């Protein structure tokens, strides 16, 4: 924990809110020009944890809520998530009367304490029903996007997440009216009949310096799973798939050349860095264990 910096780190400016910049970016409205504008959604660790806990706590029923944050450039930042007092069946949720009063009161109370962020989106949980936009979510997301432009639909699946051990969070945004534009068919199948109406987004997560510092001492028995990590063995299929997509991207960039090369180089660097990190861990293990009593 020493021989480094302990003050405001380079992962804390993401948590800083600038009112003037947000006002300028809201007045600019760069989203209306290119409709494929937003492509990245950065969610805080706290927001994701709260969303997953609330979705799982609902049991087999469906739950819904809001999420705060802001928007910068080509990315949407989602910082906090607060639930709603909704009473939904196994398929549909309504949020009839007490949900909106809760929204207004909670936003006002949060602004009282110091929460300077505004509402940035809504989320609703599919209890084992995959991760896609239904014919009602599409309509309500279009309704929200028509007037409150900075918005995003987050879909979470609690049952599948708890059964498979991996979170299933999907960020989506709807195209406006009249916007038309051995390989698996899941690309069309896993979406509803409105597959051409909405498009997904790249979901990433971030955490603060204090978040990582406190989570470093979260538990002191994963060291065994790190020493006997067995890297380059549990994700070989991942690396082969990455190599295949990298070859496809290289072919596309070569066709274009005859700026697309930048993302291909980035993907290649990422895959190679992962492989080199795995080899480094294996070399460290070999030096630690097998180089003793020779």
């Amino acid at each position: 924990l020493a021989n480094n910096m302990q003050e405001a780190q380079s992962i804390d400016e993401i948590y800083k809110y600038d009112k003037k910049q947000q006002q300028e970016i809201l007045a600019a409205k760069p989203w209306t020009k290119d409709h494929h504008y937003f492509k990245y959604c950065k969610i805080s660790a706290l927001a994701l944890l709260k969303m997953v806990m609330h979705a799982r706590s609902g049991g087999n029923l469906a739950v819904m809520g809001l999420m705060l944050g802001k928007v910068d450039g080509e990315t949407m930042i989602i910082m906090d998530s607060f639930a709603l007092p909704v009473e939904g069946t196994e398929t549909r949720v309504n949020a009839q009367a007490a949900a909106y009063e809760y929204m207004a009161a909670y936003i006002e109370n949060a602004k009282q304490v110091g929460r300077l962020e505004n509402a940035i989106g809504w989320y609703h949980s599919h209890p084992g029903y995959g991760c896609w936009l239904s014919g009602i979510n599409v309509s309500t997301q279009m309704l929200n996007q028509q007037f409150q432009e900075p918005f995003v639909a987050v879909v979470i699946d609690p049952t599948r997440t708890i059964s498979a051990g991996k979170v299933n969070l999907g960020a989506f945004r709807t195209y406006p009216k009249g916007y038309k534009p051995t390989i698996p068919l899941n690309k069309i199948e896993d979406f509803g009949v409105h597959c051409k109406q909405y498009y997904a987004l790249e979901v990433s997560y971030f955490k603060s310096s204090l978040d990582r510092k406190l989570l470093e001492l979260l538990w002191n028995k994963y060291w065994v799973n790190t020493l006997s990590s067995s890297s380059l063995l549990t994700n070989a299929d991942y690396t082969t798939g990455q190599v295949f997509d990298l070859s496809e991207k290289l072919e596309q960039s070569e066709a274009q050349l005859g700026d697309k090369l930048a993302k291909a180089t980035r993907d290649s660097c990422k895959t190679t860095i992962e492989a080199i990190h795995g080899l480094m861990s294996q070399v460290i293990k070999d030096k630690l264990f097998n180089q003793i009593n020779i």
């Binding site: 549909r92 207004a104 009602i136 979510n137 929200n144 007037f147 918005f151």
Partner: protein, 76 residues
Amino acid sequence: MLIKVKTLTGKEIEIDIEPTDKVERIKERVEEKEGIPPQQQRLIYSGKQMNDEKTAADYKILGGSVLHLVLALRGG
């Protein structure tokens, strides 16, 4: 009259309606200001949603009132 209507995302709307006037008047003010359909709108004052059947003649609005506007949302 400069009654303020605020959406949760930060949009601002200014309307002009006398207190004796019906809440349908507020509804069509926001209609001709933005265009959100009448059946897809909810308005909140003082933390309590007003009903359509209450005329704002005996109402705790004496100027400076801010109305929180939200859009109905549903999921499946």
